[PDB]
Design a protein around this ligand. Structure first.
Ligand SMILES: N#Cc1cccc2[nH]nc(N)c12
Ligand code: NA
Length: 310
């Protein structure tokens, strides 16, 4: 988790900006636009006193003062997360029936939005995405002993400075309890079977997200012979999908389109058995990761061109 000079400096600039904000209050925010929707909506906002642009997630919940004060206390844990791979946090408060979580605004939005625009994401770009997700999960586990629990393309945010960060990792037990409704389509077979689940379940979710972004389609059930010819030239209800995940072989990338190191990387993430599945330590030294790290890929450049950012 050692940072380079440029990363160390952005982290310091963020904290110095954050220290000037003070206590977050409802009437200090001006809504600019909507950034996306879930059990909550995300708005791009202006924090009028500080002049900072933020992402404000509003979770509408009717709960007694007892419950909201415990949720807010639990979200204070988010002030301790300081990493290039974790979306910056400004603060949490309650106001007129809703919890607000104020975060760093990521101008590239989430990877589900980027994928919608791009059609499919190139393998070299997914190499940088994989490095950031692994480093993000390593940071959470090593410095805070917590697991993400909700890795999916909509929880991976990107920006025009080429940064890739994780958001929405559950930190409050009470906030989840008072809710308790996001998709279960990225959950590992072992979590869907209620059995033993560690950071290995986040690795499965990463593997699945990477296949979806590479092929441009949620990868379950697998695409047929004709669906692949449509893609590279070369319906299922949620309950049927979850049964498919638990009972059928895992998805895989099509061969002949992707490098064998990339195919091997996703196969090691998607091994059904969590014990056999690669761990964070092993993924960090996988051939695909070492190769992607040595590649000097202009992620910001690719991103701005693809989504018309600027
Ligand atoms: N979309 C989105 C989103 C969700 C949570 C935090 C955020 N910061 N910047 C965003 N665009 C964003
Ligand atoms: Na979630």
């Amino acid at each position: 988790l050692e940072l380079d000079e440029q990363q160390r400096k952005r982290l310091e600039a963020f904290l110095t900006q954050k220290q000037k904000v003070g206590e977050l209050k409802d009437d200090d925010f001006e809504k600019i636009s909507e950034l996306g929707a879930g059990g909550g909506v995300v708005f791009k906002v202006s924090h009028k006193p500080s002049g900072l642009v933020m992402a404000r997630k509003l979770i509408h919940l009717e709960i007694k003062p007892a419950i909201r004060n415990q949720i807010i206390r639990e979200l204070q844990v988010l002030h301790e997360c300081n990493s290039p791979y974790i979306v910056g946090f400004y603060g949490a408060f309650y106001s007129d029936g809703e919890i607000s979580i104020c975060m760093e605004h990521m101008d590239g939005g989430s990877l589900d939005q980027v994928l919608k625009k791009a059609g499919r994401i190139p393998e070299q770009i997914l190499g940088k995405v994989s490095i950031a997700v692994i480093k993000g999960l390593t940071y959470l586990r090593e410095k805070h002993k917590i697991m993400h629990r909700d890795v999916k393309p909509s929880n991976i945010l990107v920006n025009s400075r080429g940064e890739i960060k994780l958001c929405d990792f559950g930190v409050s037990g009470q906030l989840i309890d008072s809710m308790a409704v996001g998709t279960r389509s990225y959950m590992s077979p072992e979590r869907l079977q209620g059995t033993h689940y560690s950071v290995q379940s986040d690795i499965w979710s990463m593997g699945l997200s990477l296949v979806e972004m590479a092929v441009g389609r949620y990868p379950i059930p697998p695409p047929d012979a004709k669906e692949l010819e449509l893609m590279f030239g070369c319906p299922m209800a949620i309950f049927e999908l979850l049964d498919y995940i638990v009972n059928e072989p895992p998805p895989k990338l099509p061969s002949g389109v992707f490098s064998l190191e990339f195919q091997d990387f996703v196969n090691k993430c998607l091994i059904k058995n969590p014990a056999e599945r690669a761990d964070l330590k092993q993924l960090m030294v996988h051939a695909f990761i070492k190769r992607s790290d040595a590649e000097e890929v202009d992620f910001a450049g690719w991103l701005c061109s693809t989504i018309g950012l600027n």
